[PDB]
Amino acid sequence: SMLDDAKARLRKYDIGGKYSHLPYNKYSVLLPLVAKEGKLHLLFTVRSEKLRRAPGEVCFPGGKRDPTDMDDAATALREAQEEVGLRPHQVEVVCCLVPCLIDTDTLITPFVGLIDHNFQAQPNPAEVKDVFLVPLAYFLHPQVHDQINHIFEYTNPEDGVTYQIKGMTANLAVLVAFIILEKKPT
Numbered sequence: 001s002m003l004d005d006a007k008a009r010l011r012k013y014d015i016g017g018k019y020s021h022l023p024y025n026k027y028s029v030l031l032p033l034v035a036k037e038g039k040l041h042l043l044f045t046v047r048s049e050k051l052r053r054a055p056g057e058v059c060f061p062g063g064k065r066d067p068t069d070m071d072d073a074a075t076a077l078r079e080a081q082e083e084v085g086l087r088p089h090q091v092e093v094v095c096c097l098v099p100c101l102i103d104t105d106t107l108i109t110p111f112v113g114l115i116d117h118n119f120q121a122q123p124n125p126a127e128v129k130d131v132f133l134v135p136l137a138y139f140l141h142p143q144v145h146d147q148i149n150h151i152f153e154y155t156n157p158e159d160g161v162t163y164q165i166k167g168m169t170a171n172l173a174v175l176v177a178f179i180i181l182e183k184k185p186t
């Protein structure tokens, strides 16, 4: 099946807890995969304009580890619940992808999660201005704009709204698309 095939592919790239104890400032993100209309999608957030760090930017759910978290995956799930109402029974964490080093002292660990079909986002407006889906296949043939760094522009066909996706968030989306969609019979 589509979902069993995606999980099998993802597991081959799992690094597990290999880098998890290193003494960094630690953040986790959840890369949430949603199946709709017979295709996989990634779920993104738009950060609230009142946040001091990166207002109005497209981001995956996530945040800083705190002492309650049993592990890095728990960070991702706790933050996703706070931001978009995703409950733990609604997500299966499949793997941990290569972590992202930034600022010399920070390590961001991405987890891919399969999201239940009955989940409906409840954006928490103190943190999230918007939530939207992009088909995973978009990231194989994105609409690129050069600002010099590459920015993706995705237009939702439901409503015509265009979102800019860039940086680590864009990078991770392409990685997941490659992992799941490369070398597939039609």
Ligand SMILES: COc1cccc(CC(=O)Nc2cccc(Cl)c2)c1
Pocket: 027, 028, 029, 045, 046, 047, 048, 051, 058, 059, 060, 061, 062, 063, 064, 083, 108, 127, 128, 168, 169
């Ligand atoms: C983009 O690079 C990142 C670096 C460190 C963490 C994160 C995840 C995050 O913080 N997401 C998030 C989304 C919506 C609202 C709020 Cl409060 C947080 C992303």
